[PDB]
Design an enzyme around this catalytic site. Structure first.
Site, short mmCIF file in Angstrom:
data_model
loop_
_atom_site.label_atom_id
_atom_site.label_comp_id
_atom_site.label_asym_id
_atom_site.label_seq_id
_atom_site.Cartn_x
_atom_site.Cartn_y
_atom_site.Cartn_z
N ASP B 83 0.86 -1.17 0.00
CA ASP B 83 0.00 0.00 0.00
C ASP B 83 0.90 1.22 0.00
OD1 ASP B 83 -2.29 1.57 0.10
OD2 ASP B 83 -2.54 1.43 2.25
N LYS B 84 0.31 2.37 -0.25
CA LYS B 84 1.05 3.62 -0.27
C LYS B 84 0.52 4.54 0.82
CE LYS B 84 0.02 7.42 -2.10
NZ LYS B 84 -0.13 8.69 -2.85
N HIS B 85 1.35 5.47 1.26
CA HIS B 85 0.93 6.46 2.25
C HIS B 85 1.46 7.81 1.79
CE1 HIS B 85 -0.93 8.14 5.58
NE2 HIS B 85 -0.08 7.84 6.55
N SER B 86 1.01 8.88 2.45
CA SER B 86 1.41 10.22 2.08
C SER B 86 1.16 11.17 3.24
CB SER B 86 0.59 10.65 0.86
OG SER B 86 0.86 11.98 0.44
N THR B 123 -9.36 11.27 -0.25
CA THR B 123 -9.47 10.30 -1.32
C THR B 123 -10.80 9.54 -1.30
OG1 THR B 123 -8.39 8.33 -2.30
CG2 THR B 123 -8.05 8.74 0.05
N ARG B 171 -1.96 16.63 22.30
CA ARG B 171 -0.82 17.26 21.62
C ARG B 171 -1.28 18.51 20.90
NH1 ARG B 171 0.85 13.25 17.35
NH2 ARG B 171 1.73 15.17 16.47
N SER B 186 2.47 8.34 14.82
CA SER B 186 1.08 8.62 14.49
C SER B 186 0.72 8.30 13.03
CB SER B 186 0.79 10.09 14.79
OG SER B 186 -0.45 10.49 14.26
N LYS B 190 -1.94 3.68 11.83
CA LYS B 190 -3.06 3.07 11.16
C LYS B 190 -2.65 2.34 9.88
CE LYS B 190 -3.94 7.50 8.88
NZ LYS B 190 -2.52 7.92 9.14
N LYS B 191 -1.66 2.88 9.19
CA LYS B 191 -1.20 2.29 7.94
C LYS B 191 -0.52 0.93 8.11
CE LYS B 191 -1.97 4.07 4.55
NZ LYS B 191 -3.05 3.89 3.54
#
EC number: 2.4.2.4
Lengths: 440, 440
Positions: B83-86, B123, B171, B186, B190-191
């Site tokens: 999968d990808k993250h950003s 998204t 925070r 953080s 979840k990823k």
């Protein structure tokens, strides 16, 4: 300034806070407009970055102002308003003789104390041993007592530095307790709220001080003298020995009995006398009631020898609903313990060490202290005829005399007293009673 | 370890926390056994002292574990779960083409996204433009879709890293937000909770990146690659240009239209293509589906040219209740805005600067975004035919084409688009689309 989260950012980045910013933050704590997290965050930042002198002053004044601040201008008193403060200490009855002594010398002591919540003891609990002593007189009456007698020892009006109530709470659960600027601010807070002209902090040093190292005690005392004077109150501090019980007694009633005997000259523990006398000259010079340590010590001693010291104490007691003849007939008024019995060391030798903490706790566990901070206390229980460091303890020299309520109560006590006083072959070196006078 | 206030003390003194201590603290946040003040205190300490690699890993895994962690062992998939993250980006539609492309190449993308709560976009909101798209399929169905098609884009199951929900909150109000170890933990949280084999972070760089300075972006990307790989997930990161909208469109439906055109070869923005292609090769090498950047780029391009990329996207849509013929008949399905009208610059010249933030916000304020994070959004509104940096804008070259709901809606938009795109006499220097590949 607004936004308590940006005030945090400011300090966190190593920047300093302005008065307005600190006043706003402290008030927000009081009014519940600032969250626990925001309090702990600012606190953690102050722990790392510390606070400059003008910030330290502002924190203390921001807190003192969050509540009530007494004013004696209307009383038209022709004398300085002075009082003493401390960081606690087992057997530190000094406050009971200090009041009269300075009152007899032209001062006025609006001594608003707090109820002893644990270990260290409580000066108000001590005075509640006197049958009918009233520590909660109304403002009018309180001022009436200061004007008429010169001193009064009462309980807090709950309106004294409330911002500090929730500030300490959070610090107490976030590891941001041990921080000089926070501590000094918190300590002077309620005390400056009496409207003092001159103060004198008694920073205990030793195996029972507030601070761990002498370096730390000294550090606190200099910081207190800095912010105090910055608050306008002519303050000085003293590093006093606290490696053994200051007085010859630790308890409630038993300490009140020593306080009257010191005043009537019946008996005065050498050590307790040095510290008590030292604290007063400070108050006398700061209050401008004497200009030389020689003139001060010549003033206090006169009063101590001519009776006026005992007399003011009497008039104070009677004025706060205690017996009119307490000073002379205290023996008839003060509660006498059920079982008074001495304790000797298993072996003989010399007292080398003393865990005042363990001693303070024993009294707590013996009845002379509030465990749950709500439960009643036996005003008769305690220690008397305590052994000083350097004293020899044989079959005829007890470590102390325990005033318990029953054998089992005396049992715990004896073992505790035994476990807190270390013996040796040779008596240790003599330590100073008053280390140094931090000032100017 | 116990006592969250002593865990604080440990770190505060510059010491490091063990796994057990961090796991206990993170769980305490989840179960409400740790107060807001204690969270903010630990946070402020981590801000000052930072965290070592093994602490950074533990924080991320402690959080990923606080909730759900998907497992694909039972699915018996003969292919890597990637999968990808950003870190967000206006016009970053890349995820829509990335899914099919890697699925067509042997991968499996369990893309669990979140609803766009503001500015940066979302998204999932984009995909909700497709009539009847279902982002909330049950686990069984979700797994059915991964196995059958190879990719699925769904919404979070609310059970993903819940400890992070209350951690960020505190925070967010205590100035302990900007701290690399906290942020990385953080972000991966979840990823990693999808049970990935290989990940690839896309750390945006520029006038619209998560971090302010390139140095900071780079700093984050290295820290993410460190903890990610430390979590067992073969991860790499890329610094990508974000000084202008990545795609030629910014919105919901208008971006979905670009995603299908990129897949069918109808139209492919040069820049969007480089970053999209770059992100995939990483996934292909990390997933072990290709071993040379040459083999990877030879693989992805084939799929892009032979139709399989568009096809997988179609099968994904149809599988999530969208139209069976969306790819070919998207024009019939996607909402068309009321008022489509272009905007030209007051003066001519060259696009020198672009405030993607202001652009992202305009779309929000135009309807294409959730203001209150609860209010509905118009899926038709947005920008298309955006002008790239370096392009000349005359009376025939508009800055962009605004798809609004009415004149007044188009009015705000036009002024905003105008105010965010700076013009000059000469076109600025050409900047790289993909700066560097942080790895190993």
């Amino acid at each position: 300034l607004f936004l308590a989260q940006e005030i945090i950012r400011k300090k966190r980045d190593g920047h300093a806070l302005s008065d307005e910013e600190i006043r706003f933050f402290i008030n927000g704590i009081r009014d519940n407009t600032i969250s626990e997290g925001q309090i702990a965050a600012l606190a953690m930042t102050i722990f790392f970055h510390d606070m400059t002198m003008p910030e330290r002053v502002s924190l203390t004044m921001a807190m003192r102002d969050s509540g009530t601040v007494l004013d004696w201008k209307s009383l038209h008193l022709n004398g300085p308003i002075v009082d003493k403060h401390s960081t606690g200490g087992v057997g530190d009855v000094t406050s009971l003789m200090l009041g009269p002594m300075v009152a007899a010398c032209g001062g006025y002591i609006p001594m608003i104390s707090g109820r002893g919540l644990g270990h260290t003891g409580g000066t108000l609990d001590k005075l509640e041993s006197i049958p009918g002593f009233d520590i909660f007189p109304d403002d009018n009456r309180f001022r009436e007592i200061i004007k008429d007698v010169g001193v009064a020892i009462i309980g807090q009006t709950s309106s004294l530095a409330p911002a500090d109530k929730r500030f300490y709470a959070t610090r107490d659960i976030t590891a941001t307790v041990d921080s000089i600027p926070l501590i000094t601010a918190s300590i002077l807070a309620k005390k400056l709220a009496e409207g003092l002209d001159a103060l004198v902090m008694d920073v205990k040093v030793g195996s029972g001080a507030f601070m761990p190292t002498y370096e730390l005690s000294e550090a606190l005392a200099e910081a207190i003298v800095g912010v105090a004077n910055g608050a306008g109150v002519r303050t000085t501090a003293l590093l006093t020995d606290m490696n053994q019980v200051l007085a010859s007694s630790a308890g409630n009633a038993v300490e009140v009995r020593e306080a009257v005997q010191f005043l009537t000259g019946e008996y005065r523990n050498p050590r307790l006398f040095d510290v008590t006398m030292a604290l007063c000259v400070e108050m006398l010079i700061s209050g401008k009631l004497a200009k030389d340590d020689a003139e001060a010590r010549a003033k206090l001693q006169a009063v101590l020898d001519n009776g006026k010291a005992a007399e003011v104490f009497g008039r104070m007691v009677a004025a706060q609903k205690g017996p009119t003849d307490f000073v002379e007939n205290y023996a008839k008024y003060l509660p006498t313990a059920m079982l008074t019995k001495a304790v000797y060391a298993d072996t003989e030798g010399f007292v080398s060490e003393m865990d005042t903490r363990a001693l303070g706790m024993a009294v707590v566990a013996m009845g002379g202290g509030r465990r749950q901070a709500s439960d009643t206390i036996d005003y008769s229980v305690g220690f008397t005829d305590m052994a000083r460091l350097g004293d020899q303890v044989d079959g005829q020299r007890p470590l102390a005399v325990i005033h318990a309520k029953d054998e089992n109560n005396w049992q715990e006590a004896a073992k505790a007293v035994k476990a807190a006083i270390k013996l040796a072959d040779k008596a240790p070196e003599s330590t100073p009673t008053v280390y140094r006078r931090i000032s100017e």
